[PDB]
Design a protein around this ligand. Structure first.
Ligand code: HEC
Ligand code: HEC
Ligand code: HEC
Ligand code: HEC
Ligand code: HEC
Ligand code: HEC
Ligand code: HEC
Ligand code: HEC
Ligand code: HEC
Ligand code: HEC
Ligand code: HEC
Ligand code: HEC
Ligand code: HEC
Ligand code: HEC
Ligand SMILES: [Ca+2]
Ligand SMILES: [Ca+2]
Ligand SMILES: [Ca+2]
Ligand SMILES: [Ca+2]
Ligand SMILES: [Ca+2]
Lengths: 519, 259, 519
């Protein structure tokens, strides 16, 4: 059985923690629930850590007092099809392989599934670790609670004796790097300096051997990613988000300074050896828009190249951990701002961006966002009980599973079927435009080899490549974004029509140039 | 927000609690979750209580850390028909009125329903308090969570200015007495001596005016009826049970000395 | 009403039958249930047949004593979509037409449906008989019991006056030949010599006019294909399987000599005029893996060509009725073993194999097979009754319809939804790789015309054609195989990654060669 420790003894050295813990709703929660610090207390000084205390990062540290939220969180939505490749005619991006050629996502890009699996899915996806990590067997894919208990309880490593990224299976890639893990786990929260910069107190950084890092990580989406364990108050821990909102002064709602002020973030920094080490962002309100934006954003978490001169931008560069914090119509400018692109298209040779799940940036300015609605209202609503203590569902999933609470309490004018029909109108329309965008992209891409072989000039090809950047951006935003337009239907429509317009321009340019060479 | 108290200071006068609390699975649960003892600590000695500290008896004192168990407890089983009289041809005892004639249960004896309602149902049944206590209105009969929050949030008293048992409706009885309440609530656990015997330290006893007693009671089937709040270990608190098993030596399984 | 005959009189000439019938569980079943032999008995001698007795091949011959198994077998699974073309974006092989160009399956290749329809479906599919045979009208497609009663009760023949294979509808093929029928019916079991070799006692052979043969055939999947009618014991009757297992000594489990010995097959031969004529394979155990392998295998049942010199291999050649009895990684060697390929690709000119539903060969070595699980455990389990005499379901279908009996009795750790989720993880993953394999195949195929027209050398084209064989094999195995990887997920994954690797090699080879001609 746990035996409490004397927190006052801790607080003598840990004034920041004292200030947070004594005031919040965890003031009565003893440190022993999450820390084993006996040897630490014996050996620390005011400024030197001494022996490092043990800190529990497992979600069960919270589950003894908050079983309802834990059990809600670890639920597996079996209806969320697992390991479902997006580059198939029945998924999100029928022509993804042609359009993304040159990028690691060509090796595999599945639809998301339940949060319990985020870290294991990251480890096992074909594009990440060369097939090094796999489920112990194909039964383990169902085991959400097991994954939550720890990735290494359900996975194997093909070669525990080496730590290099390499291909173990032929059609894999080794795209994983340390930055990725920040959106899968925060087990490393005390072992990673802010932004993943080199730091004498950090075991891990952007430049670490990702296989070695992987082996030290266990738990998905720690409870403390949204809730400070000391104050129990709302927060974010993701460095890149803090950097965008606070360091770069963009605010929590870059389009709305008033809302940014009312629903702001306070950066709190923790030091090692009296040098800044790590940071968190305390929220003014329990704002799920910002909580979920720790991960559901477009980001850089990868090496790339400079737009200016094509030179490599490695993991050592700050730009390898970057939140653009820009909507689709501001993105190109945001990428120019850091002089960055992701890959060169294998066929066209165009410098291109790689977009990832920009839900937060897409939601900005939408009708729901303007009306004060937040991710949680649709995706993790309060539970409704005929008799009971209300709590907030932590099963982050489609509102289709809880339409009464997610939609119909607000939309009293609709039945469930009507609300569903409204969602599907938007998704069907948007998907059509995604498909048409891919048709036109593919038509353009296919003209590049013809043009090159017909002797069309580099100047014309470069003109077409410049158009490719935009055609790509204004399409891929929407295959990357998970709402199929629902989060911002008017923006999707404008973007996708822009994509098609750019592709059509490029197709005309290339056909005419080809036809002129033949003539 | 709750502010923890110095439990060690409490333990300087409360060795009995210390020995349970420090060993069990509530060793880290600060006293402030269930007691307000500030004025007590200012005035007590080890031999003089001083100001009486407050002890929370509400089930929400446990719900904060054990919401799953609380919510499961308070659920109302609507399929358990409510206020269903047993002395009817379609219930348990078609000829109950003839057979029980002379007993107060003839006035009303319904089938049981969900535990959330035990105290309110005890207060409102026609055989218990002469119809003195009633739901505030007929809508309140559904409100399990409300009953758990407290009986008097959902009930009314026909005459707050009198404390005598009497009939307010013609076909009622006044069978209730203080012993009944021990199987409905243990809000009185610190105000009732073992067995309800007279005791200088007991506000309430077998011989109390049950209407006065009723007004001081709020919560059904307290969580601590089965779980010691200090050790978190399994227990019973019901005097009559302890008396049979232990005092009278009958044991927990009278037919099986080994078990 | 049937009147029994004196079996002892038969047994005087039919010692093989005596030995089987007197010992098994049909010892009390009189010959009259299946044979009308009165004139035969009057005219036969010990070695000459005399008048041929009538032998019932209809499944109702078994249904009077085994109605439960019969009714189970003839059930139509309406959820198994009928006449559903595989070459569509929502089915198994979105790019099948491009990849299979040159082969008859381009004319139509539907998903399988319930067994009741196997013979009628064979007769009416567009690739088989030039559209000669059709359902009497479009209502008849529902009539499983009718098909079982007899194909010709539900179909018509466009020209009863001719027996040649020809096209009656424009976009049909005439791929059907006598060998096909062996996996649709065994009505011909007494009229077809072992392997379909020419034989004086055989009405039909590999070289018969298939239209004439067709007209003599009525019933699908006869009950006696798995059960000897005389002994009631387990068996196979399919010549090609017996040839692989016994004649070629490969065993029932070619990868496992121990299991092959324990679960073996004994070839029993029946003679006509004291010359070997037909054969069956008695099984040591009621082993559904081998029973189902009569049909659910990769085979030759068709003419083709030699790998060595491109010469035609006709129906007269033994190779036109061949069970390769080889898993996907042994297949190329097995095809080299008989010096055979199926078709030349219409675009690339590559010699290619045509693969068909290799469930048996895929199941070998899988986790379930290694654990002693067999086709029937998942596809025709014992019926579970609260009160009743247990019997075995004969409705061969997906386990999704009977998950308790098919999966969950063994997998006590799972709910139905969890088991389904595990299936779908594998199928979704495998399908993604099938789609990616087709993408890369298509990319390669499309380069062949460009390469040829740019003047790329025959040597380079032939190098690419050699790569095409493998890219094709390691893809098509899996569109042909019906489990979408479930039967052997690791093998599918390895195979499909091999396919993609081969295609990528070919694409690079061809692009570079094209680019060198342009330069
Ligand atoms: C593991 C790190 C966790 C996390 C993520 C949370 N808790 Fe607790 N918690 C406990 C108690 C008594 C309260 C107060 C209840 C009340 O009075 O309402 C809380 C409160 C919270 C909150 C709500 C904070 C707010 O300001 O609204 C949150 C978000 C929260 N907790 C998260 C009790 C416990 C424990 C019992 C010993 C332990 C262990 C935890 N909490 C652990 C965690
Ligand atoms: C703030 C409360 C949110 C909300 C509303 C959502 N998320 Fe996430 N999410 C993350 C990852 C890596 C995945 C994929 C996991 C995997 O495939 O293994 C997801 C998935 C989702 C879904 C889809 C669920 C389904 O049933 O398919 C949804 C609806 C969703 N999320 C909403 C990553 C993260 C985080 C990084 C640590 C954080 C923080 C969030 N998500 C937060 C939220
Ligand atoms: C660094 C290169 C990586 C790699 C290898 C992966 N991630 Fe993420 N991820 C994030 C969110 C919000 C999701 C769910 C929404 C969605 O998928 O659209 C995911 C999902 C995944 C998966 C499962 C789906 C798939 O693509 O197969 C996988 C395998 C995966 N990721 C790997 C969020 C983030 C981040 C926060 C800004 C960052 C950083 C990463 N992911 C990084 C990576
Ligand atoms: C890991 C399993 C946990 C646990 C134990 C808890 N959380 Fe969360 N939480 C989030 C949001 C948006 C809310 C609602 C805030 C509001 O609208 O006021 C909560 C709330 C809580 C509580 C308070 C009681 C309640 O249920 O309302 C508790 C005790 C709690 N949580 C525990 C958001 C997040 C996350 C951001 C993506 C993550 C991660 C967690 N919660 C994780 C957990
Ligand atoms: C922190 C260490 C403490 C201390 C010093 C005490 N308690 Fe509790 N307590 C609780 C309840 C429901 C009762 C009623 C009696 C029962 O249920 O058994 C009590 C009673 C006491 C007493 C009186 C004992 C006696 O002599 O009759 C004392 C001295 C006492 N408590 C001290 C409930 C709780 C809690 C709810 C979870 C917790 C926490 C505490 N108590 C903690 C403490
Ligand atoms: C209100 C009086 C109650 C009651 C009836 C119970 N608790 Fe708690 N409890 C808390 C913690 C951290 C644990 C240990 C969890 C673990 O490590 O497994 C417990 C445990 C229990 C038990 C189980 C005891 C056993 O020996 O198995 C029981 C029956 C129990 N509790 C009942 C935490 C808290 C609180 C957070 C501050 C509070 C408040 C309560 N418990 C209150 C109560
Ligand atoms: C559909 C048949 C129902 C049922 C089952 C009930 N009602 Fe009503 N009701 C309405 C109002 C304004 C009241 C009084 C509210 C108040 O003063 O607090 C009620 C009351 C009841 C009761 C309690 C009766 C009692 O004597 O105490 C019950 C059991 C009840 N309702 C059930 C209003 C309406 C309507 C508005 C047009 C309609 C329709 C209903 N009620 C319908 C029903
Ligand atoms: C003292 C005279 C009383 C009175 C007036 C009531 N009770 Fe009880 N009670 C107990 C149990 C286990 C039940 C449920 C099982 C069952 O009813 O058979 C009840 C139920 C009730 C009800 C609801 C049903 C009804 O009869 O209408 C009511 C109104 C009621 N009681 C009143 C248990 C106990 C005891 C524990 C040994 C004791 C003491 C009492 N009850 C005492 C009384
Ligand atoms: C039509 C050719 C068939 C086929 C395919 C089968 N039977 Fe029969 N059968 C009959 C009886 C009395 C038994 C024994 C029942 C028992 O004692 O268990 C059987 C048995 C079988 C089996 C099981 C054999 C085994 O060794 O396990 C099988 C596979 C089988 N039969 C198939 C009776 C009859 C008939 C009644 C006159 C007729 C007709 C059939 N069977 C026909 C067939
Ligand atoms: C041994 C018991 C088996 C099992 C487990 C299966 N079969 Fe067959 N099968 C054959 C043919 C020609 C078809 C297609 C029929 C048509 O399309 O008309 C099938 C179909 C199946 C299915 C799919 C059923 C569905 O609902 O779609 C399944 C699950 C299946 N089979 C399993 C041919 C043959 C045989 C040749 C005579 C034999 C023997 C078997 N099958 C045996 C089995
Ligand atoms: C409701 C939408 C349906 C569907 C699904 C079908 N029918 Fe009819 N149908 C009717 C008659 C007299 C015939 C011809 C009968 C005969 O001469 O044998 C049919 C035919 C069909 C077919 C076969 C079509 C073909 O081209 O061969 C099919 C697939 C079919 N039906 C399906 C009569 C009627 C009705 C009488 C008013 C109505 C209503 C329907 N049919 C409706 C439907
Ligand atoms: C000789 C060229 C033929 C032709 C014309 C057909 N068959 Fe078969 N067949 C077999 C099995 C196991 C199935 C079900 C599994 C699956 O289809 O993948 C089938 C199915 C069919 C169909 C229906 C599906 C379709 O392709 O449209 C048709 C029309 C069909 N066959 C025609 C098994 C076998 C064999 C056993 C080794 C052999 C021989 C054949 N089939 C031969 C042919
Ligand atoms: C045509 C409709 C029939 C009929 C009348 C029967 N069979 Fe089969 N059968 C097969 C398998 C794998 C078993 C189970 C063997 C075992 O696990 O022990 C059976 C079993 C039977 C029985 C025995 C009683 C029972 O139901 O278990 C009977 C009487 C029976 N069958 C009759 C396999 C096949 C086939 C291979 C694909 C085919 C064809 C048939 N059965 C067909 C029929
Ligand atoms: C009904 C169609 C199913 C499905 C969906 C699954 N099984 Fe089985 N299975 C069994 C055993 C002994 C194992 C290996 C156990 C171990 O060694 O850990 C398995 C394995 C699986 C897997 C994992 C496959 C892999 O390649 O890793 C999966 C996805 C699976 N099963 C699903 C045992 C049995 C049975 C006993 C007779 C039967 C029936 C089933 N399984 C059926 C099914
Ligand atoms: Ca999903
Ligand atoms: Ca990006
Ligand atoms: Ca009841
Ligand atoms: Ca099918
Ligand atoms: Ca073949």
């Amino acid at each position: 059985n746990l035996k409490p420790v004397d927190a006052m003894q801790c607080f003598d050295c840990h004034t920041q923690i004292e200030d947070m813990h004594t005031v919040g709703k965890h003031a009565t929660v003893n440190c022993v629930h999450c820390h084993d610090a006996t040897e630490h207390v014996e050996t620390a000084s005011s400024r030197r850590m001494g022996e490092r205390p043990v800190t529990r990062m497992d979600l069960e540290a919270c589950a003894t007092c908050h079983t309802a939220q834990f059990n809600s969180f670890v639920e597996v939505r079996h209806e969320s099809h697992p390991r479902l490749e997006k580059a198939t005619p029945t998924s999100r991006s029928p022509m993804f392989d042609k359009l993304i050629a040159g990028h690691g996502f060509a090796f595999e890009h599945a639809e998301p599934r339940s949060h319990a699996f985020m870290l294991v899915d990251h480890f096992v996806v074909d594009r990440a670790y060369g097939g090094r990590f796999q489920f112990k067997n194909w039964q383990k894919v169902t085991d959400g609670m097991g994954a939550v208990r720890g990735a290494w309880t359900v996975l194997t490593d093909a070669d525990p004796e080496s730590s290099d990224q390499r291909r173990f299976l032929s059609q894999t890639a080794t795209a994983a790097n340390p930055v990725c893990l920040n959106c899968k786990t925060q087990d490393h929260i005390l072992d990673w300096a802010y932004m993943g910069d080199e730091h004498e107190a950090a075991k891990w950084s952007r430049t670490s051997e990702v296989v070695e890092f992987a082996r030290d990580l266990n738990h998905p989406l720690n409870c403390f990613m949204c809730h400070d364990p000391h104050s129990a108050g709302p927060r974010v821990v993701r460095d890149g988000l803090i950097n965008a909102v606070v360091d770069r002064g963009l605010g929590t709602y870059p389009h709305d300074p008033v809302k940014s002020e009312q629903q702001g973030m306070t950066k709190v920094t923790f030091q090692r050896g009296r040098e800044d080490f790590r940071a968190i962002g305390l929220l003014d309100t329990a704002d799920s828009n910002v909580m979920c934006a720790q991960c559901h954003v477009e980001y850089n978490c990868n090496p790339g190249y400079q737009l200016s001169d094509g030179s490599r931008v490695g993991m050592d560069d700050r730009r390898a951990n970057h939140f653009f914090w820009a909507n689709v119509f501001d993105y190109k400018e945001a990428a120019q701002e850091i002089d960055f692109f992701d890959f060169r298209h294998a066929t066209t040779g165009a410098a291109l961006p790689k977009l990832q799940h920009p839900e937060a940036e897409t939601f900005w300015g939408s009708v729901h966002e303007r009306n004060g609605v937040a991710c949680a209202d649709c995706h993790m609503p309060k539970v409704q009980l005929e008799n009971g203590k209300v709590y907030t569902s932590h099963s982050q999933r489609t509102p289709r599973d809880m339409m009464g609470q997610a939609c119909l309490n607000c939309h009293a004018e609709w039945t469930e079927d009507q609300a569903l029909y409204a969602i599907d109108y938007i998704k069907n329309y948007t998907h059509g435009k995604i498909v048409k965008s891919e048709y036109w992209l593919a038509k353009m891409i296919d003209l590049f080899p013809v043009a090159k072989r017909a002797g069309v000039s580099e100047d014309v090809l470069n003109q077409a490549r410049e158009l490719h950047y935009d055609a790509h951006l204004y399409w891929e935003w929407w295959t990357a974004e998970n709402s199929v337009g629902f989060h911002n239907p008017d923006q999707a429509r404008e973007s996708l029509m822009t994509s098609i317009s750019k592709s059509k321009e490029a197709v005309s340019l290339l056909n005419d140039a080809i036809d002129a060479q033949v003539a």
